[PDB]
Amino acid sequence: KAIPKDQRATTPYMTKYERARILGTRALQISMNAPVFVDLEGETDPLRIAMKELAEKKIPLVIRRYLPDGSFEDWSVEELIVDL
Amino acid sequence: MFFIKDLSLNITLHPSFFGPRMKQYLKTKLLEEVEGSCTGKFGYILCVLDYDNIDIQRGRILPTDGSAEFNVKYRAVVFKPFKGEVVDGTVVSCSQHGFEVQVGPMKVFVTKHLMPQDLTFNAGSNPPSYQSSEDVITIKSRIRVKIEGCISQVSSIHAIGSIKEDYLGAI
Amino acid sequence: GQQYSSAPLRTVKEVQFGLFSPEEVRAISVAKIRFPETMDETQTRAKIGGLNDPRLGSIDRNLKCQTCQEGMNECPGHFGHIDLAKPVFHVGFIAKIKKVCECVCMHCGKLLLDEHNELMRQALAIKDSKKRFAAIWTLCKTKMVCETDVPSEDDPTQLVSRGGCGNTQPTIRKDGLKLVGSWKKDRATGDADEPELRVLSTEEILNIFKHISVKDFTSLGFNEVFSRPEWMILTCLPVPPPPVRPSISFNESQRGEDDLTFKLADILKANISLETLEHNGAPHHAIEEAESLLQFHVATYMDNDIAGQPQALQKSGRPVKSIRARLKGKEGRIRGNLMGKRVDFSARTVISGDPNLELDQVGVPKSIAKTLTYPEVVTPYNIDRLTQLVRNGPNEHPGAKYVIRDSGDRIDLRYSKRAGDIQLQYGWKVERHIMDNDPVLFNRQPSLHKMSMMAHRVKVIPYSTFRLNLSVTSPYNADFDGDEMNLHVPQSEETRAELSQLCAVPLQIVSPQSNKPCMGIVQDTLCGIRKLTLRDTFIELDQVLNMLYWVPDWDGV
Amino acid sequence: VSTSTFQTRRRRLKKVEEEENAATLQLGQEFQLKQINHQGEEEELIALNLSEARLVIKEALVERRRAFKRSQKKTREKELESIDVLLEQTTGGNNKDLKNTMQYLTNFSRFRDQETVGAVIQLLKSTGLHPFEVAQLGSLACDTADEAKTLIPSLNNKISDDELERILKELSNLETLY
Amino acid sequence: LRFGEMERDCMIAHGAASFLKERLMEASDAFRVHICGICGLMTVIAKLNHNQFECKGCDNKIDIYQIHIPYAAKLLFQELMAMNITPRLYTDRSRDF
Amino acid sequence: EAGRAALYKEVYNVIASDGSYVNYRHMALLVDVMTTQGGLTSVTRHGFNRSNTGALMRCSFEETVEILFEAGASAELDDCRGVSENVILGQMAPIGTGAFDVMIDEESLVKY
Amino acid sequence: IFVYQNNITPSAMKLVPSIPPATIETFNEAALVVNITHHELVPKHIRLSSDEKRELLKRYRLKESQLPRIQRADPVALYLGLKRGEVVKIIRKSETSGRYASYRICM
Amino acid sequence: RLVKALEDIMVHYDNTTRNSLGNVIQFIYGEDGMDAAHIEKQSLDTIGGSDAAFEKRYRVDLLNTDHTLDPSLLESGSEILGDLKLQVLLDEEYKQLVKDRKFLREVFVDGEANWPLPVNIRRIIQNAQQTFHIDHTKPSDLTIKDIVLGVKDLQENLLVLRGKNEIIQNAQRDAVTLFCCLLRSRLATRRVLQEYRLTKQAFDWVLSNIEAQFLRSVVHPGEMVGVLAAQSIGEPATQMTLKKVTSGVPRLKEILNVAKNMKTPSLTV
DNA sequence: CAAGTACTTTTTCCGGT
RNA sequence: AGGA
DNA sequence: AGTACTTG
Ligand SMILES: Nc1ncnc2c1ncn2[C@@H]1O[C@H](COP(=O)(O)CP(=O)(O)OP(=O)(O)O)[C@@H](O)[C@H]1O
Ligand SMILES: [Mg+2]
Ligand SMILES: [Zn+2]
Ligand SMILES: [Zn+2]
Numbered sequence A: 001k002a003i004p005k006d007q008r009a010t011t012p013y014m015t016k017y018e019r020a021r022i023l024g025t026r027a028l029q030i031s032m033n034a035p036v037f038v039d040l041e042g043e044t045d046p047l048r049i050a051m052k053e054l055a056e057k058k059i060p061l062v063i064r065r066y067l068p069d070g071s072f073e074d075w076s077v078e079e080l081i082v083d084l
Numbered sequence B: 001m002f003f004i005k006d007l008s009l010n011i012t013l014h015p016s017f018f019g020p021r022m023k024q025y026l027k028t029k030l031l032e033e034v035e036g037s038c039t040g041k042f043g044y045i046l047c048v049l050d051y052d053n054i055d056i057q058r059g060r061i062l063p064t065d066g067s068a069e070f071n072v073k074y075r076a077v078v079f080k081p082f083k084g085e086v087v088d089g090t091v092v093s094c095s096q097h098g099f100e101v102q103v104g105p106m107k108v109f110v111t112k113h114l115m116p117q118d119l120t121f122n123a124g125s126n127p128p129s130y131q132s133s134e135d136v137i138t139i140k141s142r143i144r145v146k147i148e149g150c151i152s153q154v155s156s157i158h159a160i161g162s163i164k165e166d167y168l169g170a171i
Numbered sequence C: 001g002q003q004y005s006s007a008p009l010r011t012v013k014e015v016q017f018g019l020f021s022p023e024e025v026r027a028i029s030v031a032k033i034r035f036p037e038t039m040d041e042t043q044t045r046a047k048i049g050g051l052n053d054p055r056l057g058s059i060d061r062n063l064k065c066q067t068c069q070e071g072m073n074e075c076p077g078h079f080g081h082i083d084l085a086k087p088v089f090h091v092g093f094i095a096k097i098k099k100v101c102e103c104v105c106m107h108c109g110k111l112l113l114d115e116h117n118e119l120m121r122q123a124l125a126i127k128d129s130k131k132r133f134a135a136i137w138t139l140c141k142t143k144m145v146c147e148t149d150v151p152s153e154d155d156p157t158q159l160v161s162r163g164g165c166g167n168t169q170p171t172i173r174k175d176g177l178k179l180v181g182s183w184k185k186d187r188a189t190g191d192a193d194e195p196e197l198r199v200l201s202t203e204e205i206l207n208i209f210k211h212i213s214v215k216d217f218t219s220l221g222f223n224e225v226f227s228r229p230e231w232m233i234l235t236c237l238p239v240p241p242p243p244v245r246p247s248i249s250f251n252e253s254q255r256g257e258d259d260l261t262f263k264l265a266d267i268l269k270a271n272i273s274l275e276t277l278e279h280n281g282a283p284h285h286a287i288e289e290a291e292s293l294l295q296f297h298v299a300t301y302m303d304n305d306i307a308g309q310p311q312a313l314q315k316s317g318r319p320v321k322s323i324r325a326r327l328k329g330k331e332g333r334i335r336g337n338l339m340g341k342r343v344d345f346s347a348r349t350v351i352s353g354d355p356n357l358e359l360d361q362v363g364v365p366k367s368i369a370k371t372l373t374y375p376e377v378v379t380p381y382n383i384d385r386l387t388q389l390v391r392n393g394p395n396e397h398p399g400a401k402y403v404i405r406d407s408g409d410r411i412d413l414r415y416s417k418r419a420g421d422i423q424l425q426y427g428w429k430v431e432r433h434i435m436d437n438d439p440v441l442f443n444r445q446p447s448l449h450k451m452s453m454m455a456h457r458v459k460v461i462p463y464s465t466f467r468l469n470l471s472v473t474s475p476y477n478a479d480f481d482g483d484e485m486n487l488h489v490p491q492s493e494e495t496r497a498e499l500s501q502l503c504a505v506p507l508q509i510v511s512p513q514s515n516k517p518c519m520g521i522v523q524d525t526l527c528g529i530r531k532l533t534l535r536d537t538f539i540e541l542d543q544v545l546n547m548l549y550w551v552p553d554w555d556g557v
Numbered sequence D: 001v002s003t004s005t006f007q008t009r010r011r012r013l014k015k016v017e018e019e020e021n022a023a024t025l026q027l028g029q030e031f032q033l034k035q036i037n038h039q040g041e042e043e044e045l046i047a048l049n050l051s052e053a054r055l056v057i058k059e060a061l062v063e064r065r066r067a068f069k070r071s072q073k074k075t076r077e078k079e080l081e082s083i084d085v086l087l088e089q090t091t092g093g094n095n096k097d098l099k100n101t102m103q104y105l106t107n108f109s110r111f112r113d114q115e116t117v118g119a120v121i122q123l124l125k126s127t128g129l130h131p132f133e134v135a136q137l138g139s140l141a142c143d144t145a146d147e148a149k150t151l152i153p154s155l156n157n158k159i160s161d162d163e164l165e166r167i168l169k170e171l172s173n174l175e176t177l178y
Numbered sequence E: 001l002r003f004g005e006m007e008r009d010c011m012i013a014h015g016a017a018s019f020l021k022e023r024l025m026e027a028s029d030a031f032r033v034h035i036c037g038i039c040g041l042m043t044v045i046a047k048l049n050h051n052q053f054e055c056k057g058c059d060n061k062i063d064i065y066q067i068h069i070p071y072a073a074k075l076l077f078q079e080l081m082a083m084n085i086t087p088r089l090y091t092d093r094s095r096d097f
Numbered sequence F: 001e002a003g004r005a006a007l008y009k010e011v012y013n014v015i016a017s018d019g020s021y022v023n024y025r026h027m028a029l030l031v032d033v034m035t036t037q038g039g040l041t042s043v044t045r046h047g048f049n050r051s052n053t054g055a056l057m058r059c060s061f062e063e064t065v066e067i068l069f070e071a072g073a074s075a076e077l078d079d080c081r082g083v084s085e086n087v088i089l090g091q092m093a094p095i096g097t098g099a100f101d102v103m104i105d106e107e108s109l110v111k112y
Numbered sequence G: 001i002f003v004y005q006n007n008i009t010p011s012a013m014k015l016v017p018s019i020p021p022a023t024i025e026t027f028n029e030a031a032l033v034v035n036i037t038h039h040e041l042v043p044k045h046i047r048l049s050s051d052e053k054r055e056l057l058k059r060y061r062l063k064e065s066q067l068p069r070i071q072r073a074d075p076v077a078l079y080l081g082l083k084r085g086e087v088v089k090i091i092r093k094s095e096t097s098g099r100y101a102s103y104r105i106c107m
Numbered sequence H: 001r002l003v004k005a006l007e008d009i010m011v012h013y014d015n016t017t018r019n020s021l022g023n024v025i026q027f028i029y030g031e032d033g034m035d036a037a038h039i040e041k042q043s044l045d046t047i048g049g050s051d052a053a054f055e056k057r058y059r060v061d062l063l064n065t066d067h068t069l070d071p072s073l074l075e076s077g078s079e080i081l082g083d084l085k086l087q088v089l090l091d092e093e094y095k096q097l098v099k100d101r102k103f104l105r106e107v108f109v110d111g112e113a114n115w116p117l118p119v120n121i122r123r124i125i126q127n128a129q130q131t132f133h134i135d136h137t138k139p140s141d142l143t144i145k146d147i148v149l150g151v152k153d154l155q156e157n158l159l160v161l162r163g164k165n166e167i168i169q170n171a172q173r174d175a176v177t178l179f180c181c182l183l184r185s186r187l188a189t190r191r192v193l194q195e196y197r198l199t200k201q202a203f204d205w206v207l208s209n210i211e212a213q214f215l216r217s218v219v220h221p222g223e224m225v226g227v228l229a230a231q232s233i234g235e236p237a238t239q240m241t242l243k244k245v246t247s248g249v250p251r252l253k254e255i256l257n258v259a260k261n262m263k264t265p266s267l268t269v
Numbered sequence I: 001c002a003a004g005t006a007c008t009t010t011t012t013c014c015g016g017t
Numbered sequence J: 001a002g003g004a
Numbered sequence K: 001a002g003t004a005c006t007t008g
């Protein structure tokens, strides 16, 4: 159905699985010569660049957290706490 | 006829395009793929309306390749001809078999037999014409046709038409 | 590799199970399938317009498919068909067919009970098709008469007509592939003593099922769109293509046909006899003969291992491989080829312990690293490095095996006349050797643990064994009395992350199985750590300085 | 990949009925009267008379030329050449269909000005005729109520002959003297 | 080597969704079939070159999709069909929940 | 509920008899699974494998062909929600890494 | 409620669903000697109001299928006289959390 | 079978444990909503000993000249004497501790104190002690309000379930119960001052780290807890192979099979 | 009706009759 | 027939 | 070595 931003009840924290999937996706993208939203401070590994993008919180992705009924909450990698 | 229709193409963007000029490359890929297109289901997709308000939505990243898939929701001018539709057009082709009529994006071919009997072919004219006691149907001439049936054919739609009944024929 | 197709890519969301209507089989079919002969255009080696390819899939590997012009690796097979002379039971459905007959009128095709019986409308209520059919059967099996009129939903004095036909129902019993019933009869109130004993034909059960009401069969587990009862009886048979039953073609002049290809020809032969036998001089019994043989072949094709003992044995005594046999557990399609699979980018050797390896690394023998490849994309960040590994080639350690182009076509650096001058372009892929620090999945079978498969850092080393840190020994349950282990190389930037970010050895240290560390100091190090730490134990400067320099993180203090 | 619509039918296994399309106002599944805009709301069928459609496309490409030049920052015989120029500027060129269409509409339109197409759209959308008939009445020039009731046979019982003749008379006045 | 049933479990246990996919697809079996959107079967006569598609028996020349499945699953489905069962594959839902 | 209590107690005792320690939650979950149906659902082909999960999922243990035959007869619909169904289909299973979706937001992309 | 010593004739048993909307319950005296609800292993079951169930399902985004089930013949479902569809809230002590709330729908 | 029976079970984004049919198995994973690796055996002090020993450990009476906190324990010690308003707070505190103690004895019938719970409090305090160089001689700069209310606030922040409704909120309260019994027991006023000797600075740090640790300790929606449970029972069973009642592998076999005709049926009266 | 019967999943992954 |  | 099933 798609749950509104006010009314979102899932964790404000990013899941171990979310973080891994984001780093993977961005590494795969950077590696496919996608634009990088961070200064590569001499960086060359797309995974190492992905960590830097997630650290500077400059990853233009969104996690769609599906619920067992089918509904979902959308969360920006920007808004997700990284205590991981 | 000539309708305005709400349609939605799915586009698949390669990661190297995830720059700020994204919505722009997308809106264009839609226009490349969709405008000029001819489908049986919707007819000729002619002109994509309201460029400024084309809906890109959030695009899902497909797991193994980094590409993202977007459902580009849009609105366009279409042309889906029907049997029984009365159309006006200009003649183009003309032979012993009949004459073809250009109607917007599509041609309609009128059979020698789908015309009144009085109209006879004339090979010895420039360009080859169809002659009646009153009328002379030829290349640049304007004609009102009734579409008898159409054939959905790849990048086009073609139809067989009549000028035999009342109020049809030369204009 | 498969070629570009303009068809939209999508994923399977639902699997809609069902049965084939004969009409569908005929419709989907690319040919029927008249001659049991496989090919030889009268000895002339080329496929026949009769069995395997009267427009089906392709053989030869040379020479493309007729109907899709694709050829071998692209062409899924194409189905054909065999219009059976007489109907036959599907081996699988035999008991459901029986149970349905036991529930319905063997004459009018109406349910033996209805909305009028209390227990029946009670059973009809059940939402679960499987559980409701179970209930319907147990009530209806008993009812041995189709009722014309029954007591009304108010009083027994006035009885309402439910639906016609009075006929006594047979007491059906199976005699392996045949349904034979026993009608109680009536004769002067008595009979039975001695009831009517006659076998129920496929064709009669078909006609009763054909007459079962949509509402009626739908009250049984059935579905008017995907699975009608009549479809449990086979009329027109789908002939699977070569990809399903490939000919293991030894030499150039030798067939090597599949078991399925032979059993199909048996069916054809059994069918042809029956057809001519009835069309021609019909010696009445000689037909029920050839019919029962056709039933047998169509039975043993789908399932050879039937209760009713006679196994269809190949001329050699060895029995025929049924289709059911192909799908049966551990080894065979499901558990054998789908749940588990043999895989590329995998290596296996003897393991040995190394105190000089870090907990999270794995000693990878050079030879293994020079075989296992990772497909790296040509990017500006790596362009120069990759250009050098390609230059190095397949036999230098930091080297490459292939260069994959934009074109999709694979360059072999082992033979390509251009293996030297190979100018790399962004977006190409270089299949480079496995290198120090690449994450790899390490595993020791059994594999009863989350920790029996952990990700390690490559460490290319000499000698032919995989080297592992000693503390990592416990989660794997490994020892070095000759144990071997498996290595798996991820081919994606995405899968590599999964491994480093989730299954890495250090992540696995504390285990949820018992909420405590699953790795610790073991053997030599445990034995020596006690000895080193006694009150009695003092060390002189000379050694103290070496004991220090050895800690790679020592403050220099 | 090809285009899809707002109609969400689930033809599960059951293929057909492929019903014919006519002057029984029996158009496709797609060109049905009860349509649905992407906002989900039920909206009615939009059929355009040549004159109306000529303006729509012209308008669209005009504003597309605006957006293109914005993103590049950091007399019927004459209307024909004017249009052929705008097409070089906005459309992919490869679209021979649009050039052919615009030439056709430019040469076949009855109502040249926006205000003219306005009054046509008002006068007609009061009859209660299905947007297809309302378009054909606007795009085919008719004199007898018979001429119209013949070429648009669906009209047959829908309007009065005299009422249709009043309407045909107003449309004839509205014809922009090219 | 065999990435077996048990090994599949450890992968499921880790939550390595893509790594499991990769082992079972790209690193083994993986194949491309064309399926009909009306009867969810591999019926399609994909003459991918002349860009012709077709599913005679549905007369469908439009509603066709390409899917990526293990060749052994292509096999399983053809085997299930030879035995009269229909494993119809659909790229959209109809049940919700 | 006392069934769950007894069942757990007994399970725990087999584990603790060896001297081993398995954290509550693992045994709790097994016991909870056998329970939820309202009775004592055994961990056998004729027990759990006869529940209403996916036809393909169920055929992947013990009754294979027999299960699939029944699916075709009763026109069963596989949800494709189970792990095993995606494993068969060569699809990214809704497990860990696949339990949610990933999308590009154009707004944030043009913001950076 | 009808508390009987040894048996109830199948003649008399046919008159139990005879008077709806009113309801009847049979009970063997021998079973009633000990109150099972008093046992160590027996947690607090609580019958929910039609509005409470409505909320439980809304709050957990459930269909009635999805909840754990209690059999209509369960000693505790008998003690409380649970009817088909009626939901029980079970409150057990936890070595994990100290207090754990489960739910069971009636069969 | 254990694997095949539990394969499709995982923790969803509503902290709920469900199968491939979305049926609820457990309302919250392991009844507490905690990831197993983040748990450690911890002694619940409150649980045992004499009612007398408890009183000495937890009781603070600012209205009694003998049972106040000596002005050596904290700075306010002098001015805290006979303060009736504060004494209300310590009475709430004490009565809550006694409630806990009775409840714990209901759960752990045999008085077993050692239970695995998340957040090792003993370490946080130990670490605060070296981090801040705690002087076991000097008086603390803590208020009775600073401790009593401080603990009371942290409790509202140990979040497992997030929903804005009574149903979900009670689930949260319930799931967090036992942990808070430990929290209140290890963080009582008398204890913090007399035993730990913390400063306001150190106490604030202890409090933030409990919060932080607790949040890190919750299960991650995605966890295939079914397979994990199967393997976590299965693996040990393989390692036990590779009144004298049937036990080990064969009794486990008896169990999973729900075997009717069991080998050694026995009643304990 | 019961006894005694067949099947079945009956641990995993790695030279050649 | 062998291997952990 | 067990379980529903099957056949006497
Ligand atoms: N049939 C089998 N199937 C699966 N794993 C097996 C197996 N046989 C042996 N193993 C594995 O190999 C390990 C070693 O067994 P053995 O080679 O006999 C030496 P050990 O019994 O462990 O005693 P030791 O360490 O004091 O010498 C086992 O613990 C087990 O994991
Ligand atoms: Mg060994
Ligand atoms: Zn082919
Ligand atoms: Zn009858």
Ligand SMILES: [Zn+2]
Residues within 6 Å of the ligand: E036, E037, E038, E039, E040, E041, E043, E055, E057, E058, E060
């Ligand atoms: Zn089809």
